[PDB]
Amino acid sequence: SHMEQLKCCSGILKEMFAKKHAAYAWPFYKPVDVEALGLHDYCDIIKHPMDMSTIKSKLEAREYRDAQEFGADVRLMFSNCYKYNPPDHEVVAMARKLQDVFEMRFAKM
Numbered sequence: 001s002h003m004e005q006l007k008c009c010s011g012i013l014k015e016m017f018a019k020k021h022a023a024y025a026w027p028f029y030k031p032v033d034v035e036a037l038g039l040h041d042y043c044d045i046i047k048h049p050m051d052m053s054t055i056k057s058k059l060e061a062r063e064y065r066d067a068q069e070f071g072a073d074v075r076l077m078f079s080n081c082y083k084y085n086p087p088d089h090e091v092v093a094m095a096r097k098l099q100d101v102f103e104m105r106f107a108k109m
């Protein structure tokens with residue numbers, strides 16, 4: 001059921017925002033500040049930005065038909081991080097820790 005699975009998606013996102021994962025999830029909470037120092041080329045490289053607060057808003061506005069569409073936006077958020085940053089960047093390691101949480105929950109739902 002699409003309704004039941006979207007409720008599960010809201011539960012996954014709630015865990016990603018939880019204190020348990022806060023040490024590595026915090027860079028993903030809000031949209032990337034493209035006006036910040038070092039991010040002058042972000043919009044040239046990242047054509048479709050995504051963050052957890054935007055996904056929470058899309059869930060609330062019924063913008064996902066099913067769990068696969070919610071999953072696509074979570075993976076877009078991580079892929080943007082892996083595309084923009086150098087592979088040894090601190091934020092890439094944080095993205096992998098949070099993607100581990102997401103993938104385990106998304107697979108078992």
Ligand SMILES: Cc1cc(-c2ccccc2Oc2ccccc2)c[nH]c1=O
Nearest residue numbers: 027028032033080081084085090091094
């Ligand atoms: C998804 C994402 C997020 C951020 C980012 C967002 C808010 C504040 C600081 C931030 O930078 C950090 C740099 C090192 C470690 C952690 C964060 C920067 N770059 C990205 O690609």
